[PDB]
Amino acid sequence: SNADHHAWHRLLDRALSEQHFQLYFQPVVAARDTHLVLHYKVLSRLLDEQGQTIPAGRFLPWLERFGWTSRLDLLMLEQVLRQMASHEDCLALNLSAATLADPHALNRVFEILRQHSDLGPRLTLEIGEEQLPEQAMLEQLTRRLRELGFSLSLQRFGGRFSMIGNLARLGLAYLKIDGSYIRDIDQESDKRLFIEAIQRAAHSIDLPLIAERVETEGELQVIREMGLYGVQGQLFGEPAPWG
Amino acid sequence: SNADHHAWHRLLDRALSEQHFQLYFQPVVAARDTHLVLHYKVLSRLLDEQGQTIPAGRFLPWLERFGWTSRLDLLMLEQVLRQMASHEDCLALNLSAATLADPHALNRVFEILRQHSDLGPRLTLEIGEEQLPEQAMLEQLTRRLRELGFSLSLQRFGGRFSMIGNLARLGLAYLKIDGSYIRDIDQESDKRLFIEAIQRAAHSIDLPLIAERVETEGELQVIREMGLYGVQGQLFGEPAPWG
Protein backbone atom coordinates (compact mmCIF):
# COMPACT_ATOMS: atom_id res chain seq x y z
CA SER A 1 0.00 0.00 0.00
CA ASN A 2 3.07 2.22 -0.13
CA ALA A 3 1.22 3.47 -3.21
CA ASP A 4 -2.31 3.75 -1.84
CA HIS A 5 -0.84 6.26 0.57
CA HIS A 6 0.27 8.30 -2.45
CA ALA A 7 -3.16 7.90 -4.20
CA TRP A 8 -5.19 9.06 -1.20
CA HIS A 9 -2.54 11.59 -0.27
CA ARG A 10 -2.50 13.19 -3.70
CA LEU A 11 -6.31 12.99 -3.49
CA LEU A 12 -7.16 14.74 -0.22
CA ASP A 13 -4.46 17.36 -0.51
CA ARG A 14 -6.09 18.66 -3.68
CA ALA A 15 -9.55 18.41 -2.11
CA LEU A 16 -8.39 20.60 0.81
CA SER A 17 -6.79 23.19 -1.46
CA GLU A 18 -9.49 23.21 -4.13
CA GLN A 19 -12.62 22.90 -1.98
CA HIS A 20 -13.81 19.58 -3.35
CA PHE A 21 -15.81 18.90 -0.17
CA GLN A 22 -19.58 18.99 -0.43
CA LEU A 23 -21.78 20.17 2.41
CA TYR A 24 -24.38 17.71 3.64
CA PHE A 25 -27.06 18.13 6.32
CA GLN A 26 -28.48 15.59 8.75
CA PRO A 27 -31.68 16.86 10.47
CA VAL A 28 -31.72 16.63 14.25
CA VAL A 29 -35.31 16.67 15.49
CA ALA A 30 -37.60 16.71 18.53
CA ALA A 31 -38.26 13.38 20.24
CA ARG A 32 -41.82 14.50 20.96
CA ASP A 33 -42.39 15.46 17.36
CA THR A 34 -39.97 14.46 14.66
CA HIS A 35 -41.55 17.02 12.32
CA LEU A 36 -39.90 19.68 14.47
CA VAL A 37 -36.22 20.18 13.66
CA LEU A 38 -33.90 21.70 16.27
CA HIS A 39 -30.94 22.17 13.99
CA TYR A 40 -29.10 20.45 11.18
CA LYS A 41 -25.89 18.58 11.83
CA VAL A 42 -23.30 19.42 9.17
CA LEU A 43 -21.51 16.56 7.35
CA SER A 44 -18.75 16.72 4.73
CA ARG A 45 -18.76 14.47 1.71
CA LEU A 46 -16.82 13.86 -1.49
CA LEU A 47 -18.23 13.23 -4.95
CA ASP A 48 -16.90 10.49 -7.19
CA GLU A 49 -16.78 10.98 -10.96
CA GLN A 50 -20.19 9.27 -11.16
CA GLY A 51 -21.68 11.74 -8.70
CA GLN A 52 -22.02 9.19 -5.88
CA THR A 53 -21.12 10.21 -2.30
CA ILE A 54 -18.03 9.35 -0.27
CA PRO A 55 -18.57 9.26 3.53
CA ALA A 56 -15.97 10.51 6.02
CA GLY A 57 -15.86 6.98 7.46
CA ARG A 58 -13.89 6.21 4.31
CA PHE A 59 -11.62 9.30 4.20
CA LEU A 60 -11.23 10.60 7.71
CA PRO A 61 -8.80 7.81 8.49
CA TRP A 62 -6.61 8.99 5.64
CA LEU A 63 -6.82 12.55 6.94
CA GLU A 64 -5.66 11.33 10.34
CA ARG A 65 -2.66 9.41 8.88
CA PHE A 66 -1.57 12.55 7.06
CA GLY A 67 -2.39 14.88 9.96
CA TRP A 68 -4.62 17.19 7.91
CA THR A 69 -7.65 16.95 10.11
CA SER A 70 -7.29 20.53 11.33
CA ARG A 71 -6.84 21.49 7.70
CA LEU A 72 -10.30 20.24 6.96
CA ASP A 73 -12.09 21.56 9.97
CA LEU A 74 -11.31 25.04 8.81
CA LEU A 75 -12.40 24.50 5.30
CA MET A 76 -15.74 23.38 6.57
CA LEU A 77 -15.94 26.19 9.04
CA GLU A 78 -15.49 28.95 6.49
CA GLN A 79 -17.49 27.12 3.85
CA VAL A 80 -20.40 26.71 6.29
CA LEU A 81 -20.42 30.27 7.68
CA ARG A 82 -20.55 31.26 4.03
CA GLN A 83 -23.54 28.92 3.48
CA MET A 84 -25.33 30.33 6.52
CA ALA A 85 -25.95 33.81 5.16
CA SER A 86 -28.53 32.39 2.71
CA HIS A 87 -30.80 31.33 5.55
CA GLU A 88 -31.82 31.51 9.22
CA ASP A 89 -31.70 27.88 10.39
CA CYS A 90 -29.52 26.52 13.20
CA LEU A 91 -26.41 24.53 12.42
CA ALA A 92 -24.09 22.15 14.24
CA LEU A 93 -20.48 21.76 13.16
CA ASN A 94 -17.90 19.14 13.96
CA LEU A 95 -14.67 20.03 15.78
CA SER A 96 -11.65 17.72 16.02
CA ALA A 97 -9.21 16.99 18.85
CA ALA A 98 -6.58 17.57 16.17
CA THR A 99 -7.72 21.18 15.84
CA LEU A 100 -7.95 21.66 19.61
CA ALA A 101 -4.47 20.30 20.47
CA ASP A 102 -2.99 22.73 17.95
CA PRO A 103 -2.81 26.32 19.27
CA HIS A 104 -2.26 27.73 15.77
CA ALA A 105 -5.41 25.98 14.50
CA LEU A 106 -7.66 27.28 17.20
CA ASN A 107 -6.44 30.80 16.90
CA ARG A 108 -7.35 30.44 13.24
CA VAL A 109 -10.82 29.34 14.21
CA PHE A 110 -11.30 32.30 16.58
CA GLU A 111 -10.00 34.66 13.88
CA ILE A 112 -12.66 33.19 11.56
CA LEU A 113 -15.46 33.30 14.13
CA ARG A 114 -14.59 36.97 14.84
CA GLN A 115 -15.36 37.79 11.21
CA HIS A 116 -18.80 36.21 11.54
CA SER A 117 -20.15 37.37 14.91
CA ASP A 118 -23.73 37.72 13.56
CA LEU A 119 -23.97 33.93 13.21
CA GLY A 120 -23.13 33.07 16.80
CA PRO A 121 -26.69 32.14 17.77
CA ARG A 122 -27.02 29.78 14.82
CA LEU A 123 -23.79 27.84 15.01
CA THR A 124 -23.09 25.18 17.57
CA LEU A 125 -19.69 23.51 17.39
CA GLU A 126 -19.68 19.93 18.61
CA ILE A 127 -16.67 18.11 20.03
CA GLY A 128 -16.54 14.40 20.83
CA GLU A 129 -16.16 12.99 24.31
CA GLU A 130 -13.92 10.15 23.18
CA GLN A 131 -11.38 12.69 21.97
CA LEU A 132 -11.56 15.50 24.53
CA PRO A 133 -9.24 18.22 25.99
CA GLU A 134 -8.06 18.41 29.60
CA GLN A 135 -10.21 20.31 32.11
CA ALA A 136 -8.32 23.62 32.03
CA MET A 137 -8.24 24.22 28.26
CA LEU A 138 -11.88 23.17 28.00
CA GLU A 139 -13.18 25.88 30.31
CA GLN A 140 -10.91 28.36 28.48
CA LEU A 141 -12.27 27.18 25.16
CA THR A 142 -15.90 27.81 26.16
CA ARG A 143 -14.98 31.24 27.50
CA ARG A 144 -13.37 32.16 24.20
CA LEU A 145 -16.52 30.91 22.46
CA ARG A 146 -18.91 32.67 24.88
CA GLU A 147 -17.19 36.00 24.21
CA LEU A 148 -17.78 35.48 20.48
CA GLY A 149 -21.35 34.29 20.96
CA PHE A 150 -21.08 30.65 19.86
CA SER A 151 -22.41 27.48 21.40
CA LEU A 152 -20.55 24.25 22.20
CA SER A 153 -21.91 20.70 22.51
CA LEU A 154 -20.56 17.26 23.29
CA GLN A 155 -21.23 14.20 21.21
CA ARG A 156 -20.56 10.46 21.41
CA PHE A 157 -21.32 11.11 25.08
CA GLY A 158 -21.77 8.47 27.77
CA GLY A 159 -18.43 6.78 28.40
CA ARG A 160 -16.91 9.65 30.35
CA PHE A 161 -20.08 10.06 32.42
CA SER A 162 -17.82 10.30 35.48
CA MET A 163 -16.98 13.84 34.32
CA ILE A 164 -20.62 14.88 34.37
CA GLY A 165 -19.96 17.34 37.18
CA ASN A 166 -17.46 19.54 35.42
CA LEU A 167 -19.88 20.18 32.64
CA ALA A 168 -21.87 22.69 34.60
CA ARG A 169 -19.19 25.27 34.70
CA LEU A 170 -19.44 25.26 30.92
CA GLY A 171 -22.77 26.08 29.42
CA LEU A 172 -22.87 23.52 26.69
CA ALA A 173 -25.76 23.94 24.35
CA TYR A 174 -26.60 20.31 24.52
CA LEU A 175 -25.36 16.81 25.08
CA LYS A 176 -25.46 14.27 22.31
CA ILE A 177 -25.59 10.74 23.68
CA ASP A 178 -23.68 7.95 21.92
CA GLY A 179 -26.21 5.88 20.03
CA SER A 180 -24.57 2.79 21.48
CA TYR A 181 -26.36 3.50 24.78
CA ILE A 182 -29.64 3.55 22.87
CA ARG A 183 -29.29 0.73 20.37
CA ASP A 184 -32.01 -1.73 21.06
CA ILE A 185 -33.31 -0.03 24.16
CA ASP A 186 -36.84 -1.02 23.15
CA GLN A 187 -35.95 -4.67 23.88
CA GLU A 188 -33.06 -4.20 26.32
CA SER A 189 -34.45 -2.46 29.41
CA ASP A 190 -31.07 -2.75 31.18
CA LYS A 191 -30.09 0.17 28.99
CA ARG A 192 -32.73 2.56 30.31
CA LEU A 193 -31.42 2.71 33.86
CA PHE A 194 -28.26 4.29 32.44
CA ILE A 195 -30.17 6.90 30.44
CA GLU A 196 -32.27 7.88 33.48
CA ALA A 197 -29.12 8.60 35.47
CA ILE A 198 -28.02 10.86 32.62
CA GLN A 199 -31.33 12.76 32.39
CA ARG A 200 -31.45 13.25 36.15
CA ALA A 201 -27.93 14.70 36.00
CA ALA A 202 -28.35 16.61 32.73
CA HIS A 203 -31.77 17.99 33.72
CA SER A 204 -30.08 18.86 37.01
CA ILE A 205 -27.74 21.27 35.20
CA ASP A 206 -30.22 22.30 32.47
CA LEU A 207 -28.37 20.42 29.80
CA PRO A 208 -30.64 19.10 27.06
CA LEU A 209 -30.04 15.59 25.75
CA ILE A 210 -30.01 14.40 22.15
CA ALA A 211 -30.07 10.76 21.13
CA GLU A 212 -27.53 9.91 18.44
CA ARG A 213 -28.03 7.29 15.76
CA VAL A 214 -31.62 6.32 16.24
CA GLU A 215 -32.29 3.64 13.63
CA THR A 216 -35.74 2.22 14.50
CA GLU A 217 -39.26 3.35 15.47
CA GLY A 218 -38.95 1.14 18.56
CA GLU A 219 -35.99 3.09 19.95
CA LEU A 220 -37.79 6.29 19.08
CA GLN A 221 -40.86 5.44 21.19
CA VAL A 222 -38.92 4.74 24.37
CA ILE A 223 -36.76 7.82 23.96
CA ARG A 224 -39.99 9.79 23.43
CA GLU A 225 -41.57 8.18 26.51
CA MET A 226 -38.48 8.83 28.67
CA GLY A 227 -38.66 12.45 27.53
CA LEU A 228 -35.27 13.27 25.97
CA TYR A 229 -35.14 16.55 24.04
CA GLY A 230 -33.70 15.51 20.72
CA VAL A 231 -33.22 12.74 18.26
CA GLN A 232 -31.19 12.08 15.09
CA GLY A 233 -30.23 8.99 13.16
CA GLN A 234 -30.73 6.93 10.04
CA LEU A 235 -34.43 6.74 10.88
CA PHE A 236 -34.86 10.21 9.39
CA GLY A 237 -33.57 9.68 5.87
CA GLU A 238 -30.04 10.18 4.61
CA PRO A 239 -28.17 13.46 4.96
CA ALA A 240 -28.26 15.64 1.91
CA PRO A 241 -27.18 18.80 0.20
CA TRP A 242 -29.09 21.83 1.33
CA GLY A 243 -32.59 21.45 0.04
CA SER B 1 15.89 -9.62 31.88
CA ASN B 2 15.80 -13.00 30.17
CA ALA B 3 17.07 -14.03 33.61
CA ASP B 4 14.75 -12.02 35.84
CA HIS B 5 11.98 -14.03 34.23
CA HIS B 6 13.71 -17.17 35.51
CA ALA B 7 14.28 -15.65 39.02
CA TRP B 8 10.65 -14.61 39.51
CA HIS B 9 9.42 -17.69 37.70
CA ARG B 10 11.38 -20.07 39.90
CA LEU B 11 10.15 -17.91 42.80
CA LEU B 12 6.36 -17.84 42.38
CA ASP B 13 6.08 -21.41 41.18
CA ARG B 14 7.47 -22.61 44.50
CA ALA B 15 5.29 -20.16 46.41
CA LEU B 16 2.17 -21.59 44.69
CA SER B 17 3.17 -25.19 45.36
CA GLU B 18 4.48 -24.67 48.89
CA GLN B 19 1.96 -22.15 50.22
CA HIS B 20 4.38 -19.31 50.83
CA PHE B 21 1.57 -16.75 50.62
CA GLN B 22 0.57 -14.98 53.81
CA LEU B 23 -2.98 -13.91 54.52
CA TYR B 24 -3.51 -10.23 55.21
CA PHE B 25 -6.70 -8.36 56.16
CA GLN B 26 -7.79 -4.84 55.27
CA PRO B 27 -10.80 -3.68 57.38
CA VAL B 28 -13.73 -2.29 55.43
CA VAL B 29 -15.86 -0.10 57.71
CA ALA B 30 -19.01 1.99 58.03
CA ALA B 31 -18.89 5.52 56.65
CA ARG B 32 -21.13 6.67 59.50
CA ASP B 33 -18.90 5.06 62.08
CA THR B 34 -15.48 3.78 61.17
CA HIS B 35 -15.39 1.80 64.43
CA LEU B 36 -17.96 -0.50 62.86
CA VAL B 37 -16.45 -3.02 60.46
CA LEU B 38 -18.61 -4.61 57.76
CA HIS B 39 -16.12 -7.21 56.68
CA TYR B 40 -12.41 -7.65 56.07
CA LYS B 41 -11.00 -7.59 52.58
CA VAL B 42 -8.50 -10.42 52.10
CA LEU B 43 -5.03 -9.61 50.67
CA SER B 44 -2.16 -11.97 49.82
CA ARG B 45 1.41 -11.11 50.65
CA LEU B 46 4.88 -12.61 50.51
CA LEU B 47 7.55 -12.48 53.20
CA ASP B 48 11.16 -11.66 52.40
CA GLU B 49 13.98 -13.31 54.35
CA GLN B 50 13.97 -10.25 56.66
CA GLY B 51 10.28 -10.70 57.40
CA GLN B 52 9.21 -7.60 55.45
CA THR B 53 6.09 -7.75 53.24
CA ILE B 54 5.83 -8.00 49.46
CA PRO B 55 2.66 -6.46 47.94
CA ALA B 56 0.81 -8.00 44.99
CA GLY B 57 1.49 -4.78 43.07
CA ARG B 58 5.01 -6.16 42.83
CA PHE B 59 4.22 -9.83 42.03
CA LEU B 60 0.86 -9.96 40.36
CA PRO B 61 2.40 -8.72 37.14
CA TRP B 62 4.75 -11.68 37.18
CA LEU B 63 1.83 -14.01 37.81
CA GLU B 64 0.07 -12.56 34.77
CA ARG B 65 3.13 -13.01 32.50
CA PHE B 66 3.33 -16.65 33.53
CA GLY B 67 -0.43 -17.19 33.45
CA TRP B 68 -0.64 -18.55 37.01
CA THR B 69 -3.22 -16.12 38.26
CA SER B 70 -5.92 -18.79 38.48
CA ARG B 71 -3.35 -20.92 40.25
CA LEU B 72 -3.17 -18.39 43.01
CA ASP B 73 -6.81 -17.59 43.35
CA LEU B 74 -7.42 -21.15 44.40
CA LEU B 75 -4.65 -21.26 46.87
CA MET B 76 -6.12 -18.26 48.57
CA LEU B 77 -9.60 -19.63 48.38
CA GLU B 78 -8.81 -22.87 50.16
CA GLN B 79 -6.37 -21.21 52.52
CA VAL B 80 -9.01 -18.64 53.50
CA LEU B 81 -11.95 -21.04 53.94
CA ARG B 82 -9.56 -22.92 56.20
CA GLN B 83 -8.84 -19.69 58.15
CA MET B 84 -12.55 -18.95 58.49
CA ALA B 85 -13.42 -21.85 60.77
CA SER B 86 -11.51 -20.16 63.63
CA HIS B 87 -13.95 -17.26 63.70
CA GLU B 88 -17.30 -15.74 62.72
CA ASP B 89 -16.36 -12.52 60.90
CA CYS B 90 -17.26 -11.67 57.30
CA LEU B 91 -14.67 -11.91 54.56
CA ALA B 92 -14.21 -10.60 51.04
CA LEU B 93 -12.04 -12.48 48.55
CA ASN B 94 -10.56 -11.43 45.25
CA LEU B 95 -11.49 -13.22 42.01
CA SER B 96 -9.59 -12.84 38.74
CA ALA B 97 -10.74 -12.61 35.11
CA ALA B 98 -8.08 -15.25 34.54
CA THR B 99 -10.00 -17.67 36.76
CA LEU B 100 -13.35 -16.75 35.18
CA ALA B 101 -12.29 -17.17 31.53
CA ASP B 102 -11.05 -20.66 32.37
CA PRO B 103 -13.89 -23.21 32.69
CA HIS B 104 -11.62 -25.72 34.45
CA ALA B 105 -10.68 -23.12 37.08
CA LEU B 106 -14.19 -22.16 37.93
CA ASN B 107 -15.38 -25.70 38.21
CA ARG B 108 -12.52 -26.10 40.67
CA VAL B 109 -13.80 -23.13 42.63
CA PHE B 110 -17.36 -24.52 42.75
CA GLU B 111 -15.99 -27.92 43.81
CA ILE B 112 -14.20 -26.12 46.66
CA LEU B 113 -17.17 -23.97 47.65
CA ARG B 114 -19.35 -27.12 47.75
CA GLN B 115 -17.08 -28.54 50.45
CA HIS B 116 -17.59 -25.41 52.55
CA SER B 117 -21.30 -24.60 52.30
CA ASP B 118 -21.49 -23.48 55.98
CA LEU B 119 -19.35 -20.43 55.15
CA GLY B 120 -21.55 -19.04 52.40
CA PRO B 121 -22.94 -16.17 54.48
CA ARG B 122 -19.46 -15.04 55.49
CA LEU B 123 -17.64 -15.07 52.19
CA THR B 124 -18.13 -12.50 49.50
CA LEU B 125 -16.09 -12.95 46.33
CA GLU B 126 -15.25 -9.70 44.58
CA ILE B 127 -14.54 -9.34 40.87
CA GLY B 128 -13.26 -6.18 39.20
CA GLU B 129 -15.22 -4.14 36.70
CA GLU B 130 -12.18 -3.37 34.57
CA GLN B 131 -11.73 -7.08 33.94
CA LEU B 132 -15.27 -8.44 33.68
CA PRO B 133 -17.13 -11.33 31.93
CA GLU B 134 -19.77 -10.96 29.22
CA GLN B 135 -23.41 -10.59 30.28
CA ALA B 136 -24.46 -14.23 29.84
CA MET B 137 -21.70 -15.94 31.86
CA LEU B 138 -22.07 -13.32 34.59
CA GLU B 139 -25.71 -14.11 35.33
CA GLN B 140 -24.81 -17.83 35.20
CA LEU B 141 -21.95 -17.23 37.59
CA THR B 142 -24.18 -15.57 40.21
CA ARG B 143 -26.73 -18.36 39.87
CA ARG B 144 -24.05 -20.96 40.53
CA LEU B 145 -22.97 -18.90 43.55
CA ARG B 146 -26.55 -18.33 44.81
CA GLU B 147 -27.18 -22.08 44.80
CA LEU B 148 -24.10 -22.54 46.99
CA GLY B 149 -24.97 -19.62 49.26
CA PHE B 150 -22.14 -17.18 48.45
CA SER B 151 -22.18 -13.48 47.74
CA LEU B 152 -20.61 -11.59 44.83
CA SER B 153 -19.46 -7.96 44.65
CA LEU B 154 -17.92 -5.65 42.09
CA GLN B 155 -14.89 -3.51 42.72
CA ARG B 156 -12.94 -0.79 40.90
CA PHE B 157 -16.45 0.23 39.87
CA GLY B 158 -17.41 3.42 38.04
CA GLY B 159 -16.03 3.26 34.51
CA ARG B 160 -18.60 0.80 33.20
CA PHE B 161 -21.44 2.75 34.84
CA SER B 162 -23.33 2.36 31.55
CA MET B 163 -23.95 -1.27 32.58
CA ILE B 164 -25.64 -0.23 35.81
CA GLY B 165 -28.95 -1.65 34.62
CA ASN B 166 -27.89 -5.24 34.20
CA LEU B 167 -26.72 -5.40 37.74
CA ALA B 168 -30.19 -5.78 39.15
CA ARG B 169 -30.76 -9.18 37.75
CA LEU B 170 -27.80 -10.23 39.86
CA GLY B 171 -28.02 -9.66 43.55
CA LEU B 172 -24.55 -8.41 44.20
CA ALA B 173 -23.76 -8.02 47.84
CA TYR B 174 -22.31 -4.62 47.29
CA LEU B 175 -20.59 -2.28 44.91
CA LYS B 176 -17.10 -1.06 45.59
CA ILE B 177 -16.45 2.26 43.90
CA ASP B 178 -13.03 2.97 42.37
CA GLY B 179 -11.22 5.33 44.70
CA SER B 180 -10.31 7.42 41.69
CA TYR B 181 -13.87 8.80 41.69
CA ILE B 182 -13.37 9.83 45.30
CA ARG B 183 -9.81 11.13 45.39
CA ASP B 184 -9.94 14.71 46.46
CA ILE B 185 -13.70 14.97 46.48
CA ASP B 186 -13.46 17.25 49.51
CA GLN B 187 -11.91 19.95 47.28
CA GLU B 188 -13.24 18.87 43.88
CA SER B 189 -17.03 19.15 43.99
CA ASP B 190 -17.27 18.21 40.28
CA LYS B 191 -16.70 14.70 41.51
CA ARG B 192 -19.79 14.54 43.72
CA LEU B 193 -22.32 14.87 40.93
CA PHE B 194 -21.01 11.54 39.59
CA ILE B 195 -21.32 9.79 42.96
CA GLU B 196 -24.91 11.04 43.42
CA ALA B 197 -25.92 9.48 40.12
CA ILE B 198 -24.44 6.21 41.37
CA GLN B 199 -26.23 6.30 44.75
CA ARG B 200 -29.54 7.16 43.10
CA ALA B 201 -29.10 4.15 40.81
CA ALA B 202 -27.56 1.81 43.39
CA HIS B 203 -30.10 2.76 46.08
CA SER B 204 -32.68 2.23 43.33
CA ILE B 205 -31.74 -1.46 43.12
CA ASP B 206 -30.82 -1.87 46.82
CA LEU B 207 -27.15 -2.15 46.09
CA PRO B 208 -24.97 -0.80 48.88
CA LEU B 209 -21.94 1.30 47.95
CA ILE B 210 -18.43 1.10 49.37
CA ALA B 211 -15.78 3.73 48.79
CA GLU B 212 -12.40 2.27 47.83
CA ARG B 213 -9.06 3.78 48.77
CA VAL B 214 -10.05 6.54 51.11
CA GLU B 215 -6.79 8.20 52.12
CA THR B 216 -7.82 11.38 54.01
CA GLU B 217 -10.25 12.57 56.71
CA GLY B 218 -11.51 15.15 54.20
CA GLU B 219 -12.72 12.52 51.74
CA LEU B 220 -14.21 10.60 54.63
CA GLN B 221 -16.40 13.50 55.77
CA VAL B 222 -18.01 14.08 52.38
CA ILE B 223 -18.59 10.38 51.82
CA ARG B 224 -20.15 10.29 55.30
CA GLU B 225 -22.29 13.35 54.51
CA MET B 226 -23.42 11.93 51.14
CA GLY B 227 -24.41 8.76 53.00
CA LEU B 228 -22.54 5.89 51.32
CA TYR B 229 -22.62 2.59 53.22
CA GLY B 230 -18.98 1.65 53.41
CA VAL B 231 -15.43 2.85 53.39
CA GLN B 232 -11.93 1.34 53.15
CA GLY B 233 -8.51 2.72 52.38
CA GLN B 234 -5.10 3.66 53.71
CA LEU B 235 -6.81 5.96 56.20
CA PHE B 236 -7.51 2.92 58.39
CA GLY B 237 -4.01 1.59 58.96
CA GLU B 238 -2.18 -1.01 56.92
CA PRO B 239 -3.56 -4.48 56.27
CA ALA B 240 -2.25 -7.14 58.57
CA PRO B 241 -2.16 -10.76 59.55
CA TRP B 242 -5.19 -11.86 61.46
CA GLY B 243 -5.02 -10.17 64.82
Residues on chain B touching A209 (C-beta within 8 angstroms): none
Asked whether the beta carbons of residue A189 and residue B162 sit closer than 8 angstroms, the reply is no
Query: Is A194–B158 a contact, with Cβ atoms under 8 angstroms apart?
Result: no
* Nearest Cα residue in chain B from A157: B162
Q: Which residues of A touch B170 (CB under 8 A)?
A: none
In Å, how far are A106, A136, B36 from A147, measured between CA atoms?
15, 17, 53
- DSSP conformation class of B233: S
Beta-carbon contacts of residue A45 (< 8 Å; ≥ 6 apart): A21, A22, A24, A53, A54, A55, A56, A239
**Nearest by CB to B197, which of A168, A169, A197?**
A197
DSSP secondary structure letters along chain A: -HHHHHHHHHHHHHHHHHT-EEEEEEEEEESS-TTSEEEEEEEEEEE-TTS-EE-HHHHHHHHHHHT-HHHHHHHHHHHHHHHGGG----EEEEE-HHHHH-HHHHHHHHHHHHHTGGGTTTEEEEEESSS---HHHHHHHHHHHHHHT-EEEEEEETTTGGGGGGHHHHT-SEEEE-GGGGTTTTT-THHHHHHHHHHHHHHHTT--EEE----SHHHHHHHHHHT-SEE-SGGG----S--
Whether B60 and chain A come into contact, CB under 8 Å, resolves to: no
The answer to whether residue A190 neighbours chain B at the CB level (below 8 Å) is yes
**Cβ of B168 under 8 Å from any chain A Cβ?**
yes
Judged by a CB distance cut-off of 8 A, whether residue A160 touches chain B is no
CA dihedral A189, A192, A193, A198 (to 10 degrees): 170
Give the closest of A189, A196, A201 to B193, CB-based: A201
Cα gap A172→A129, rounded to integer Å: 13
What residue ranges define each of the domains in chain B, with the CATH number in brackets? 1-243 (3.20.20.450)
